[PDB]
């Protein structure tokens, strides 16, 4: 419909004649400067913002959007023409390829009409690469929404990297030398595989009919850094009644090694088909990557925050269908806000919930998983793995900067117990399938839930007697709540009355405070994460006083209540976490004392 030569002119006009008032308003031909860098091998990639083209030709940006593979080659050939102009120094022949390119160019210039076959491919006149950066107008597209209609277009997405292969050299322009003639042969490659050439099409051997057999040479050929990765739907975009959906992404050039599993990245690139037949061909798709970037209210809200029972109301909003466990519901809220990590300190507040079956453990975890921004649910894979050769982060990795709810914690694999032990220690996961201790960042609060062996809990049987989990591993947890279903006819009647209401109403009974919508709760959390409250040194005196007091009670306590410095460290996390709930950047005695109260109650739960 349109003349690509005319488009080639427009880009050449744009690149040569686009500038931006840089820092201190410096009128600078931004791309013009980059071309000069490219001319002297000082750059390799040339990322291009389409909004710059939108600044003077939004229609061109639209045509780039409706088809991107075409315009990439147009720009690349457009830059190919411009670069010889901007050359101003004969820089050193960096790597054999440039001097090889120089050698070929002299040979070609030594030649006058010529058949199209006897000419070098554009892809070999390279060692520069070009990528686009999507316009801010184009809103990011969910991986689900990338349908077949959007193939061939340029799309921006968000997601979580589930896996990424090692860097490897992808061939681009296979080069061959004839057996018995000096003519060199080329073969650009698009498919992931190909048949290598055999017989040279060289004019001399073709005329001579000598059967000059091509022999591949890597030095003549040109490779490119390459990677293969999968990206998963970000948990926020996934509907409740579905699960995350993957998408393959291909990365090459300087975009390689800018991503790890469990990185919440945003990718701009072309969505295109690949074929490794009914009513037409069926072809698997992928997303050729261009740009990768690793991503990170009303006054009544403020009035609500000012309320003293605000945080208590929010705790009541935690699973209002669940009657009871109020102080536990408070504790879960503390985990959701997390710590501060002042400096570093473990901001995540890991909690374990051991208790008899049928006491809302599993339901609570499901609510927490639905509530947290970055959430994972598992039972025990959980940890990373090396599939076949490619990394694949487990649920623990995917919970980074979030929470991993592990139901059925009692039935974990003992190796995995060691794995989470590493996470609670340094918040990283190490693994070696081939004896290669690959360490992965795992910064994620752990919400464990276990059930005692042999039915309900026996109070006479000590801790680590009703349960068969490592006591040292248990003591690592910030809080550890023992939930017992004691037959208490009054309270039993209360819970039953709560249940019958829900059946007779499909609704919780009316409380003092109605629950808030989960999204609003998350908004409060995101506001709470905005703060990093500090600990005044005066509070330390009282804090330490409380610590030695309770530690004395542990010495007084015949059973070792696991009081330690670990106990003190968590108390710091709880206090500053409460300060975040208070939206105050300085911790307070109320926050400290309340944290001690919950700590005491968790110990009281061991009664």
């Amino acid at each position: 419909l349109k003349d690509y030569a005319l488009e080639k002119e427009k880009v050449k006009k744009f690149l040569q004649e686009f500038y931006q008032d840089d820092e201190l308003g410096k009128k600078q031909f931004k791309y013009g400067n980059q071309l000069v860098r490219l001319a002297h091998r000082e750059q390799v990639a040339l990322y291009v913002d389409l909004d710059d083209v939108a600044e003077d030709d939004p229609e061109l940006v639209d045509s780039i959007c409706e088809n991107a593979r075409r315009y990439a080659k147009l720009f690349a050939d457009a830059v190919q023409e411009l670069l010889p102009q901007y050359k101003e120094r004969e820089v050193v022949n960096k790597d054999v390829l440039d001097v090889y390119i120089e050698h070929r160019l002299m040979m070609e210039q030594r030649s006058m009409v010529r058949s199209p076959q006897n000419q070098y491919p554009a892809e070999l006149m390279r060692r520069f690469e070009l990528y686009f950066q999507g316009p801010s107008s184009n809103k990011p597209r969910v991986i689900r929404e990338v349908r077949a209609d959007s193939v061939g277009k340029l799309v921006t997405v968000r997601g979580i990297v589930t896996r990424v292969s090692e860097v490897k050299p992808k061939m681009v322009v296979a080069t061959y030398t004839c057996d018995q003639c000096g003519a060199e042969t080329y073969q650009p490659i698009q498919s992931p595989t190909f048949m290598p050439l055999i017989m040279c099409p060289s004019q001399e051997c073709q005329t001579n009919r000598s059967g000059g057999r091509l022999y591949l040479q890597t030095r003549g050929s040109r490779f490119i850094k390459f990677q293969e990765m999968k990206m998963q739907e970000h948990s926020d975009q996934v509907p409740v009644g579905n699960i995350p959906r993957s998408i393959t992404v291909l990365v090459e050039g300087e975009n390689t090694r800018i991503a790890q599993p469990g990185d919440h990245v945003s990718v701009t690139g072309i969505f295109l088909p690949i074929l490794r037949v009914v009513q037409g061909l069926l072809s698997e798709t992928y997303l050729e990557a261009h740009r990768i970037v690793k991503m990170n209210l009303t006054r009544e809200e403020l009035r609500q925050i000012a309320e003293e029972d605000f945080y208590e109301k929010l705790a009541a909003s935690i699973a209002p269908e669940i009657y009871g466990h109020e102080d536990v519901k408070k504790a879960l809220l503390l985990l959701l806000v997390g710590g501060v990590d002042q400096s570093k300190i473990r901001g995540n507040i890991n909690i374990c919930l051991m208790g008899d079956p049928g006491v809302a453990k599993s339901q609570l975890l499901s609510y927490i998983d639905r509530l947290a921004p970055r959430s994972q649910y598992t039972t025990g894979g959980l940890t990373a793995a090396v599939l076949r050769l490619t990394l694949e982060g487990g649920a623990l990795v995917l919970a980074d900067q979030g929470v991993c709810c592990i139901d059925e914690f009692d039935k974990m694999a003992e190796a995995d117990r060691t794995a989470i032990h590493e996470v609670m220690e340094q918040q990283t996961i190490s693994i070696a399938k081939a004896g290669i201790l690959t360490t992965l960042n795992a910064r994620c609060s752990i919400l464990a839930a276990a059930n005692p062996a042999y039915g309900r809990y026996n109070p006479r049987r000590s801790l680590e007697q009703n349960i068969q989990l490592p006591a040292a591993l248990l003591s690592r947890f910030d809080l550890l709540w023992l939930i017992q279903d004691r037959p208490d006819r009054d309270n039993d009647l209360r819970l039953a009355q709560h249940i019958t209401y829900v059946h007779q109403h499909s609704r919780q009974p009316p409380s003092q405070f109605e629950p808030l919508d989960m999204k609003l709760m998350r908004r409060y959390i995101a506001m709470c994460r905005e703060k990093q409250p500090m600990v005044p040194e005066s509070l330390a005196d009282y804090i330490t006083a409380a610590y030695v007091e309770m530690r004395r009670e542990a010495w007084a306590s015949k059973d070792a209540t696991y009081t330690s410095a670990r106990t003190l460290l968590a108390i710091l996390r709880l206090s500053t976490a409460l300060a975040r709930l208070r939206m105050v950047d300085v911790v307070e005695k109320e926050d400290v004392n309340e944290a001690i109260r919950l700590m005491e109650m968790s110990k009281d739960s061991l009664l």
């Binding site: 419909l1 409706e66 088809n67 991107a68 593979r69 075409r70 199209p116 349908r147 077949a148 209609d149 193939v151 061939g152 277009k153 409740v240 009644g241 579905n242 699960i243 995350p244 959906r245 993957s246 295109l272 088909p273 037949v277 009513q279 037409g280 061909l281 069926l282 072809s283 698997e284 798709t285 699973a319 269908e321 008899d356 079956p357 049928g358 006491v359 809302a360 599993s362 339901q363 609510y367 639905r370 039915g455 309900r456 279903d485 037959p487 006819r489 039993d492 009647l493 819970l495 039953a496 009355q497 249940i499 019958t500 209401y501 829900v502 059946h503 007779q504 499909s506 609704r507 989960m518």
Partner: protein, 594 residues
């Protein structure tokens, strides 16, 4: 050899536009496309019978002749949308027509879908079993030739094949953005398992979905599809091209006859107090004793009421019963009673269905090496019943997946990069003899079988039946056994047995089946009086829990809620009666306290 004008297609295209031109008339279809424009979809839905009303002839032509008539209709649709809005029409390459309404004889089932309907519209009804992955299918590939500076096209439509070189052998580089691609998925339908004679073989019909119709279906969905049945190029494989798919509710309705409804109403109104026990005695008349079990089994068929909450909590109405007992007790016999009686039940063994097993599975086709997400037995029993025998011999992966479906009624799967989440809400009636026979009444039932201490929690009820060697009890059983054995039909001379068939107070099983089918639709609700009463009993069980079967827990409370709900359904009483809670409480007491 280039067509100029088609008078018939011209008129047919015009008539459709006239039909879609619903302005002077009631405006329903004009409003539809206006909603279609607002909703951004590109597939109008059409009631075929309205088309019959406006034009019976054209409607007959449409049903008899599908491919041509729809193409004209799509043309009229695209122009009509262009009339209302040109730019919105220009967004989409094409538009689609959705059929609906009554299809007189074209409404068939996969059993009855003979080859006679080829190239005729068909409204099939059935259950989706196999699903294939979404794939994008090229339709119009666009190529550029820098040598000639020339752009070409190549449609495929119904039709080495991929063009890559100019006729001058110049290279052709494709134009991905310009070209047209569409998502495309294949599934397979089968007759509804309840209404499917065992003598006849399976009659499974393929289906092709494209565009928005791709993902509007999963395995184990009761769906009605309307499409054009077409052959394929070569004894020729035959497939149905979907024009519109709709998921009929799995509840459906108890059609039957009003006589059956009236007989049920008269029978229900006769004696509501004894109807539960009268059914229970007549539920499994061949079996002697186990009266609580028969009462329990009736509640399972009746089923509770699922409660879906504002937060998405989905408290299941299904009830789950496990039978443990010594061999040579009427356990397998009892389930075959359920199979004969249950409105919608599927049998299965410990191993489950071949390959797929109990729950769903991914299956390479091996005719094209193609993945297929294939429904398993558990999913197919959704809003129904599954009868598992040798449940102890269930495999370990099934012992894993059973936790999900028991907890959620929902099997998820991500294997082979196949993300899916299938509805599997199904009351389960498992049976498993004790290991090595001869149950020891000292340890847990887990210790005798090995249910990992969790599935017992998942099961609402668990009934033990041991071969107690009481001579009185044996006399009662043996009296029953010989009485049935000695029986001869009323018309017989104590001579010949039944012929070798080449084909496969007391109430009839079919009458029972129809009755419970009607009762399942009833939606009884709580009463404050019963709600208070049950709370006393549950607390009383907690009080009785002091002595030390599994302890009474909150699982037990909701179990009683479903049982009282079930007994309420038995009498068609839309308000749960204290009798319902009363009978459930004593039944649970028998289950935990012999």
């Amino acid at each position: 050899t280039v067509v100029l004008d088609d008078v018939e297609l011209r008129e047919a295209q015009r008539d459709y536009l006239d039909f879609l031109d619903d302005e002077e008339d009631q405006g329903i279809y004009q409003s539809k496309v206006r909603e279609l424009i607002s909703d951004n979809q590109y597939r109008l839905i059409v009631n075929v019978n309205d088309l019959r009303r406006k034009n019976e002839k054209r409607a007959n032509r449409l049903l008899n002749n599908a491919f041509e008539e729809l193409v004209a209709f799509q043309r009229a649709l695209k122009d009509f949308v262009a009339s209302i809005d040109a730019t919105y029409a220009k967004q989409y390459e094409e538009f689609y027509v959705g059929l609906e309404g009554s299809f007189g004889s074209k409404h068939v089932s996969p059993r009855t879908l003979t080859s006679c309907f080829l190239s005729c519209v068909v409204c099939v009804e059935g259950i989706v079993t196999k699903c294939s992955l979404v794939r994008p299918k090229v339709v119009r590939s666009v190529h550029y030739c820098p040598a000639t500076k020339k752009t070409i096209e190549r449609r495929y439509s119904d039709l080495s094949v991929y063009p890559t070189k100019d006729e001058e052998n110049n290279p052709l580089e494709t134009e991905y953005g310009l070209s047209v691609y569409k998502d495309h998925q294949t599934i397979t339908i089968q007759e509804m398992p309840e209404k499917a004679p065992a003598g006849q073989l399976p009659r499974s019909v393929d289906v092709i979905l494209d565009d928005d119709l791709v993902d509007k279906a999963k395995p184990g969905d009761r769906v009605q599809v309307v499409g054009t049945y077409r052959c394929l190029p070569g004894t020729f494989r035959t497939v149905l091209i979907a024009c519109n798919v709709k998921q009929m509710s799995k509840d459906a309705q108890p059609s039957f006859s009003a006589e059956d409804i009236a007989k049920i109403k008269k029978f229900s109104k006769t004696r509501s107090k004894d109807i539960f026990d009268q059914l229970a005695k007549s539920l499994a008349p061949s079996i002697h004793g186990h009266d609580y079990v028969k009462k329990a089994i009736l509640c399972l068929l009746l089923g509770g009421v699922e409660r879906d909450l504002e937060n998405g909590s989905h408290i299941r109405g299904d009830i789950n019963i496990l039978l443990i007992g010594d061999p040579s007790v009427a356990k397998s016999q009892l389930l075959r009673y359920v199979l004969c009686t249950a409105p919608r039940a599927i049998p299965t063994t410990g191993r489950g269905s071949s390959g797929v097993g109990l729950t769903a599975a991914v299956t390479t086709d091996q005719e094209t090496g193609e993945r297929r997400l294939e429904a398993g037995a558990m999913v197919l029993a959704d809003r129904g019943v599954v009868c598992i025998d040798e449940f102890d011999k269930m495999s370990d992966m099934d012992r894993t997946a059973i936790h999900e479906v028991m907890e959620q009624g929902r099997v998820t799967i991500a294997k082979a990069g196949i993300h899916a989440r299938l509805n599997a809400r199904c009351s389960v009636l498992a049976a498993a003899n004790p290991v090595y026979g001869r149950y020891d009444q000292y340890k847990t039932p887990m210790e005798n079988i090995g249910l990992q201490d969790s599935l017992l929690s998942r099961f609402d009820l668990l009934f033990i039946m041991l071969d107690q060697m009481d001579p009185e009890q044996d006399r009662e059983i043996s009296d029953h056994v010989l009485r049935m054995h000695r029986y001869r039909a009323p018309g017989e001379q104590d001579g010949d047995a039944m012929p070798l068939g080449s084909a496969v107070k007391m109430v009839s099983a079919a009458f029972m089946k129809k009755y419970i089918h009607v009762a399942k639709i009833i939606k009884p609700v709580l009463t404050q009086e019963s709600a208070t009463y049950i709370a006393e009993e549950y607390s009383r069980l907690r009080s009785q829990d002091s002595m030390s079967t599994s302890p009474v827990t909150a699982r037990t409370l909701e179990t009683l809620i479903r049982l009282a709900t079930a007994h309420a359904k038995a009498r068609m009483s839309k308000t749960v009666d204290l009798q319902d809670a009363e009978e459930a409480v004593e039944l649970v007491q028998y289950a935990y306290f012999k």
